[PDB]
Design a protein around this ligand. Structure first.
Ligand code: ATP
Ligand code: ATP
Ligand code: K
Ligand code: K
Ligand code: K
Ligand code: K
Ligand code: K
Ligand code: K
Ligand code: K
Ligand code: K
Ligand code: K
Ligand code: K
Ligand code: K
Ligand code: K
Ligand code: K
Ligand code: K
Ligand code: K
Ligand code: K
Ligand code: K
Ligand code: K
Ligand code: K
Ligand code: K
Ligand code: K
Ligand code: K
Ligand code: K
Ligand code: K
Ligand code: K
Ligand code: K
Ligand code: K
Ligand code: K
Ligand code: K
Ligand code: K
Ligand code: K
Ligand code: K
Ligand code: MG
Ligand code: MG
Ligand code: MG
Ligand code: MG
Ligand code: MG
Ligand code: MG
Ligand code: MG
Ligand code: MG
Ligand code: MG
Ligand code: MG
Ligand code: MG
Ligand code: MG
Ligand code: MG
Ligand code: MG
Ligand code: MG
Ligand code: MG
Ligand code: MG
Ligand code: MG
Ligand code: MG
Ligand code: MG
Ligand code: MG
Ligand code: MG
Ligand code: MG
Ligand code: MG
Ligand code: MG
Ligand code: MG
Ligand code: MG
Ligand code: MG
Ligand code: MG
Ligand code: MG
Ligand code: MG
Ligand code: ZN
Lengths: 48, 534
RNA sequence: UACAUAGCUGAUUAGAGGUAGACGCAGAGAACUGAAACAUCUUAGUACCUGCAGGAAGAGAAAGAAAAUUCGAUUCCCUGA
RNA sequence: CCUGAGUACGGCGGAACACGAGAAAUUCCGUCGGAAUCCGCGGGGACCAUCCCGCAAGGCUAAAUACUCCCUAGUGACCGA
RNA sequence: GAAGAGACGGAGCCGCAGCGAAAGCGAGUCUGAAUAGGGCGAAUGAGUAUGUAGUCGUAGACCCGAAACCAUGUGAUCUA
RNA sequence: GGUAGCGGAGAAAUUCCAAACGAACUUGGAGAUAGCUGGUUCUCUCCGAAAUAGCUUUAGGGCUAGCCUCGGAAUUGAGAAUGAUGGAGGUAGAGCACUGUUUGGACUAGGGGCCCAUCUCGGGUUACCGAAUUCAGAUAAACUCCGAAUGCCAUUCAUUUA
RNA sequence: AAGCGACUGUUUAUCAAAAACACAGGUCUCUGCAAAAUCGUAAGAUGAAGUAUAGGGGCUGACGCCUGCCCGGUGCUGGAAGGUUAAGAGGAUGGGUUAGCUUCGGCGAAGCUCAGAAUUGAAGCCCCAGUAAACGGCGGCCGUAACUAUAACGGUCCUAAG
RNA sequence: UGAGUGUUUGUACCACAUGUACAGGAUAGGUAGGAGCCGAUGAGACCGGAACGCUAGUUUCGGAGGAGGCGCUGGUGGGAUACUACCCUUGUGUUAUGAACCCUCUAACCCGCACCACUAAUCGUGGUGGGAGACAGUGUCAGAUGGGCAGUUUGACUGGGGCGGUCGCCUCCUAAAAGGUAACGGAGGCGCCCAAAGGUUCCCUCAGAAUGGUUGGAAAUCAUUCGAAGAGUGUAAAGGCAGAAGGGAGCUUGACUGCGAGACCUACAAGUCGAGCAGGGACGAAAGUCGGGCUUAGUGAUCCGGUGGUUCCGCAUGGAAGG
RNA sequence: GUGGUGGCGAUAGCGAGAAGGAUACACCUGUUCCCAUGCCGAACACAGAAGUUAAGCUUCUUAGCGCCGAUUGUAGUGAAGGGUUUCCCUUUGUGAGAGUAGGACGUCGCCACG
RNA sequence: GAGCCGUUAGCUCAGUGGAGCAUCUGACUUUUAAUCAGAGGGUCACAGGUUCGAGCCCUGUACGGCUCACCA
RNA sequence: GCGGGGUGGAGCAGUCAGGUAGCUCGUCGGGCUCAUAACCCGAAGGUCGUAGGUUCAAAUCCUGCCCCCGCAACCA
RNA sequence: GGAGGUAUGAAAA
């Protein structure tokens, strides 16, 4: 089962990126290092 | 207590889907559901340990007394008194208050305002939890369940399962709570201890939610029954007792089933006519026309046709011994044992099992039942005597406290054996209701009931001819208990069992019962009640 | 039915009806049509019917318009648009 | 001491306000509930506070406005059987 | 004022500044972290009142033509 | 004399209700609407199409574009034709280098029969069917080792033209 | 001599006079009287100046012999426990505003105000039973006899019933 | 639309009764006051009855008698004793009562019931009986039912129409060597997938065949040789790829943010490619590559609504509502 | 001459055969070193110089394979025409594929060591 | 009229290199019937063609059985 | 072309919703009976039509294919 | 002692 997800910056809680993931292959909430335009620096973004 | 549009999904397997519930105050609510239904998860939401993915869960401001399904032993060396004392926040605040005084001396005129406020609250809070409790707790043990004071100075980890349950229950009462959240409060208790718990819960004036798989225990207390559905991922709340819930539920599924039947008949009727028109000659214009018109109704029907919920599948156990039992599977002769520093549990204990025999080790809490079984396996080395297993005897052990599982590893990793291939493991795990990627789940996230199935599955995969089972039905939902008992009854091997569940022993059909601490190898009969009375 | 009232008799008083196929106020109030179909919507509070009128009617002397600080019943016209 | 009570207002169902329930003022109708009264009351587009403006639940009122069946005197890059 | 022209009447309308959803800024402005780029504008200026003609919009809208729909009324002197 | 049209009456036929009743007649809304058919009146001069693309409850309608006409602005002249040069592409043809289809010859794995001998087993056979290889010979819109004539794109190019 | 209709009658004025309608007879069902039914917003009427041997409705259609099986489905009738269920009642809680407190912070009574959960809430529906001269429905496959054929007979699937 | 009765109930006063954990003298509810308090207005001790009871005692009523006790004091305990105030649990009542139901009443309402008067009168209105009765009827609101009735919808393409098929996107042939090009022409696919099957650094080269080799056989894995692609490239086909785009490993998240000269395509709406700049990064020593995947399908305008962010607005003003 | 490094369509290749290591390149000796094998110092990486042209490597011979490939002729086709018009023919221009003559066992550069 | 379908032992049916029933023979029985066993009986309706080879494929002829078969 | 089906000898489940191949009759063998039937006890009989995908795993899901059954293959 | 009422098995011998 593949579904679209939103990645939110853990620092400013800004819903920054849109992506998708296969729930079966990645049961746990995805986490990436992505640029946060509000803070203008790379930060940890976690799926909500 | 109220929850709206509750949603919760751990990975791919969901728990609640748009679930709702409203519980009025002063309601002794009995929470019922199969293992894994999500009964413990509900309390975690109430305790704010978990957060719903979507929806709102509403809890009153009153203080909550929580009895966990599993005992929380922070350190192995913790004493019973330390464990009980941790129920009240007296010690924690005093340590903070003592530090506050230290800060006051160091700081002269900077933080005094903050320190003074913190000191005042601690004193007021400390007085609210009146510090006289030091004496009350000591006597709460006496009046509660006749808990001896010798245990009071003993490490908690060394207590028996029944003894631990008494301590944990007393700790909840010691905290003096306003709402009682009891998660299987009688998991290991014996018949006598259950009586006290029942009477206290009957008298308790406040609201008490009880998660229990004991129907009789709930019926005496429960006035409202909340059922957590495993397939619909919803919550339904009934007024009455367990039987009333079963009666109301069975009728609803019957009335739902009849609705789905009639919707299928109408769909089949249209389908049958649509096909008749489809295969008619192209020259029959009117029939072809009517066929398309009914095709439109058929489509609208198929889009409003309720799906029948898949009935939750029950466990299937087929335990068979690889080899055959002997006339003397196990020989115990003049066996004495004592835990270093404690009275001898039994002296010159000598018994002999016969083979394909149902052997019940009867007793009360903290009498040596689990010690004897540990003695046979080799966990405990006998102080005196010998224990001899015939070379034809293979032994399978089900421990009382679920100490045979690796919490860090997954379900599949735990059951991995050199004698079984992968698909064989998956097939059996499916017989225990672990379907597809449910076997890759860590054992640390499973409920006690689901873990019990893994231990049972391990016992089954051994294919031993001697089964040393220590309270097997514990943590199991009532449906699974009957399945367990029925299959053991048909087991073609020797069974050494311990069980405080009267129903489970009846199904197995015990042959000989061994009473403790007064060693008495006796033929099984309703005279079991006579020993219990005496 | 006793008082009385109701009824009955007489006198007294002012109404009925018609228009001007116009204008005014009110009661009740369509559909074709437009929406390129159609039900919300539009035609439209229009057509028709009915009551009441007056030379005009209706409204009218702030429990208002505003927020420039102010204006000072209503009606109609230009503008706002 | 008096200053318009089953009224103002509210619920429900409709309707008029350019405004089709919309966040909805304001106004009217039906039904039910239902105030205060000068330290009071209403409005300033949900609602509250401050400020400002006004004083409902009684009545009357000419002119500017609308129309011409008719009568009088005329007019027309209006018709001419 | 003659059913006229004309006079008065500057309220009001269009143009002279644009940009932005808006606060707002302004030959710039918006986006953007940006004195970057880019969009829309200025540099690069003519509009307005009236007449007339072409076309369009609201009106029946180039003319004739339905089966029909709706609202008042008139008809049982034929026929049931 | 009674029953009147959102109706009446009907021994029942959509039967009658003033010589046409699946909903009477008259007046009004009303000049209903008609993407449909018909008609639309003087003259000469300049120019002169389209019957296509896209979308459309769209297909005999409509909208934008394409094609026509009138006016205007500006250009390092950007259009057309021809020649020269350079290009992109896989068609006609041809070919078998790949992929399908395919003929005959050589050989044969293997398969079929069939005997002896079986432990189906060890052989000897049909000029029986025969893979794969090889020799020769064909075939193709969805095959290509190849590959035009034309057409097309472009040149501060050249001539003519507009 | 056959079909249809029992019969006399009635019908598409103006293309159909019939097997169509009607009919006496049969059956079912509603109706206890201010009856049900119908006209009418209502009043008021018809039913009736009648009273279940009466009146209305459905079907069938003299007479004679008969009218078989299915109540699973759809209607109707009954049932009233349960589940579902509107308005109304009810007002736990959450926002808006701000007297007053505040450690920018923020908190926050009362009033007004915007939403409002539990609980209460009929019929109906679900559900149970009956009902077919109520609407309706009324089945397949395989084998079997000592000529052959066929199947009295036997299995089996399905159904409310075949 | 009004009276009562009764029943079961919820609320609120007012009466009462109860308070036993340990120790403590012992039946210790909490807090405040508390050195004094109570009793011939009948105290102590005593007798019985009753209630509680954890069985220890507690509380209470009565019988006699007649004047005493209790408290502070004392140690215990966390808490101390009497009595007063505020009350707090627990269980009985009284009352106010608010509901649901029960029946009953009668004066509202009703009578196509009788009699009487208006009065010629089967109307009507009054009067007296009778019946019924807060029901019915009627108004507002609400649920159900409701072809009894009403307004409407009930595609298009199409070798006529029907039936069947099709409707959007990708690939090939048709397609006539640029591009484009139709048919109810010939063939297939799409409505996804991957957390690596993306990026980068480094490294590697396939399919089959022959030969030899246990299980093992045509064909599992192993070794040499031949072998230019006859493999593989997630997924249809075409194009492309062996200087890899195929395959393995390490580290990572560029499957980045703000854009974007200029192009292709194109009626519009859209669609496609894009160097390069800035910010902050991944890999690499560096060069440099990275704005997903070998390329081309894997998608849906507006309106409306949800969620998050927001130095935007806020109908007198501050908020709010709502945008 | 050898070794690096390139340009140019393999006319540069493939196959077969011959010669040489003086230098250089290689094999070659080991794993102590940085580094490495989804096992192996085979490879990669490192240290060294016992032996050999055996192999690779370079030079040379060869047209067997592959590669390049003229002319002539023909198919096809633009334009202009004709016919008995599914097709075929004529004039003019263009002109393949195939087949063949033949070419070709490379050439044009830079650097270091000789 | 047309197109198909077939034709195999005494009967009913299978089938490009016979099965049932029937009939005989044995056994069993005092003898039979029934059983059990064994045996024989054409091969492909008739001609022609293709093929190395035809019951199998292709034609024609016989015999039968299926189907379809005209207009407003 | 539209549907329905292929599981033991026959008839049927199981298929939806992935784990383990069943029920009935029938057949074979042995019992009971003087013998047959009925009855009793044992046993056999399918890799689920077939070939590929999906999966850890396929009778079960997907795709195709082969068989058998019914209907249709043209209307004024 | 006497009367009435209360599963299959063939044909011929
Ligand atoms: N590891 C140990 N160390 C010290 N004491 C122990 C230990 N295990 C048990 N004991 C003591 O042994 C006594 C009885 O042993 P056991 O575990 O057999 O009780 P039990 O019979 O199983 O009771 P139940 O199962 O009902 O709880 C307990 O009092 C317990 O305190
Ligand atoms: N963190 C988690 N991650 C993955 N799965 C989880 C997690 N937490 C819970 N689950 C799943 O939620 C399911 C239900 O939760 P829960 O443990 O409360 O069931 P339960 O009814 O309390 O069990 P039992 O009654 O037998 O004690 C569990 O089967 C468990 O597998
Ligand atoms: K007039
Ligand atoms: K309309
Ligand atoms: K229209
Ligand atoms: K007036
Ligand atoms: K409003
Ligand atoms: K005002
Ligand atoms: K800028
Ligand atoms: K700019
Ligand atoms: K001008
Ligand atoms: K003009
Ligand atoms: K007009
Ligand atoms: K016009
Ligand atoms: K008449
Ligand atoms: K008639
Ligand atoms: K071709
Ligand atoms: K007749
Ligand atoms: K008759
Ligand atoms: K008859
Ligand atoms: K006649
Ligand atoms: K008739
Ligand atoms: K009859
Ligand atoms: K009747
Ligand atoms: K009938
Ligand atoms: K009758
Ligand atoms: K039925
Ligand atoms: K029924
Ligand atoms: K009432
Ligand atoms: K045609
Ligand atoms: K990688
Ligand atoms: K080496
Ligand atoms: K060499
Ligand atoms: K060469
Ligand atoms: Mg649990
Ligand atoms: Mg134990
Ligand atoms: Mg319209
Ligand atoms: Mg007048
Ligand atoms: Mg309005
Ligand atoms: Mg109101
Ligand atoms: Mg108001
Ligand atoms: Mg305001
Ligand atoms: Mg004022
Ligand atoms: Mg006036
Ligand atoms: Mg004349
Ligand atoms: Mg005239
Ligand atoms: Mg008349
Ligand atoms: Mg008719
Ligand atoms: Mg007529
Ligand atoms: Mg009109
Ligand atoms: Mg060709
Ligand atoms: Mg007749
Ligand atoms: Mg007659
Ligand atoms: Mg006639
Ligand atoms: Mg006639
Ligand atoms: Mg009849
Ligand atoms: Mg209708
Ligand atoms: Mg209409
Ligand atoms: Mg059409
Ligand atoms: Mg057609
Ligand atoms: Mg072309
Ligand atoms: Mg092209
Ligand atoms: Mg790839
Ligand atoms: Mg404001
Ligand atoms: Mg050539
Ligand atoms: Zn951030």
């Amino acid at each position: 089962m593949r579904v679209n997800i939103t990645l939110e910056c853990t620092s400013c809680k800004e819903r920054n990126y849109l992506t998708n993931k296969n729930k079966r292959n990645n049961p746990d909430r995805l986490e990436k290092q992505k640029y946060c335009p509000r803070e203008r620096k790379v930060t940890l973004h976690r799926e909500t | 207590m109220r929850g709206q549009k509750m949603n919760l999904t751990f990975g791919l397997e969901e728990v609640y889907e748009d679930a709702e519930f409203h519980l009025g105050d002063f309601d002794k609510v009995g929470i019922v559901g199969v293992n894994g239904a999500g009964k413990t998860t509900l309390f975690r939401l109430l305790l704010r340990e978990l957060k719903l993915d979507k929806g709102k869960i509403t809890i009153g401001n009153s203080r909550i007394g929580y009895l966990p399904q599993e005992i929380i032993i922070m350190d192995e060396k913790m004493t019973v008194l330390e464990f009980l004392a941790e129920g009240r926040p007296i010690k924690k605040m005093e340590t903070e208050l003592n530090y506050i005084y230290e800060k006051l001396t160091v700081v002269d005129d900077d933080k005094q305002d903050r320190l003074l406020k913190r000191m005042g609250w601690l004193q007021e809070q400390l007085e609210y939890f009146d510090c006289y409790e030091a004496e009350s707790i000591l006597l709460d043990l006496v009046d509660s369940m006749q808990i001896d004071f010798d245990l009071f100075d003993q490490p908690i980890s060394e207590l028996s399962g029944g003894q631990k349950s008494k301590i944990s229950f007393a700790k909840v009462l010691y905290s003096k709570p306003e709402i009682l959240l009891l998660d299987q409060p009688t998991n290991h208790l014996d018949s006598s201890t259950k009586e006290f718990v029942t009477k206290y819960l009957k008298s308790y004036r406040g609201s008490v939610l009880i998660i229990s798989h004991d129907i009789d225990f709930l019926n005496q207390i429960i006035d409202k029954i909340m059922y957590i559905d495993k397939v619909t991922h919803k919550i339904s709340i009934y007024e009455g007792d367990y039987y009333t819930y079963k009666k109301k539920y069975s009728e609803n599924q019957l009335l739902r089933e009849k609705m789905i039947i009639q919707q299928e008949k109408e769909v089949k009727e249209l389908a049958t006519f649509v096909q008749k028109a489809k295969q008619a000659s192209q020259t029959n214009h009117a029939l072809k026309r009517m066929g398309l018109e009914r095709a439109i109704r058929l489509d609208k029907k198929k889009k409003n046709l309720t799906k029948r919920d898949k009935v939750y599948k029950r466990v299937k156990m087929d335990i068979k011994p690889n080899r055959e039992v002997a006339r003397t599977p196990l020989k115990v002769e003049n066996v004495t044992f004592h835990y270093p520093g404690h009275p001898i549990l039994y002296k010159d204990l000598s018994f002999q099992i016969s083979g394909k025999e149902r052997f019940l080790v009867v007793g009360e809490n903290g009498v040596g039942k689990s010690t004897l079984l540990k003695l046979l396996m080799g966990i405990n080395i006998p102080d005196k005597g010998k224990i001899i297993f015939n070379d034809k005897t293979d032994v399978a052990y089900y421990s009382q406290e679920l100490e045979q599982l690796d919490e860090e590893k997954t379900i599949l990793e735990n059951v991995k054996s050199d004698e079984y291939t992968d698909w064989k493991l998956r097939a059996t795990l499916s017989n225990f209701l672990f379907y597809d990627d449910d076997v890759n789940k860590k054992v640390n996230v499973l409920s006690p009931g689901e873990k019990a199935r893994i231990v049972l599955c391990k016992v089954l995969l051994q294919k031993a001819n001697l089964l040393i089972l220590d309270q097997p039905t514990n943590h199991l939902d009532p449906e699974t208990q009957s399945i367990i008992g029925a299959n053991f009854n048909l087991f073609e091997g020797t069974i050494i069992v311990v069980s405080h569940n009267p129903s489970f022993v009846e199904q197995i059909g015990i042959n000989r019962m061994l009473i403790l601490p007064s060693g008495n190898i006796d033929n099984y009969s309703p005279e079991l009640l006579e020993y219990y009375s005496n």
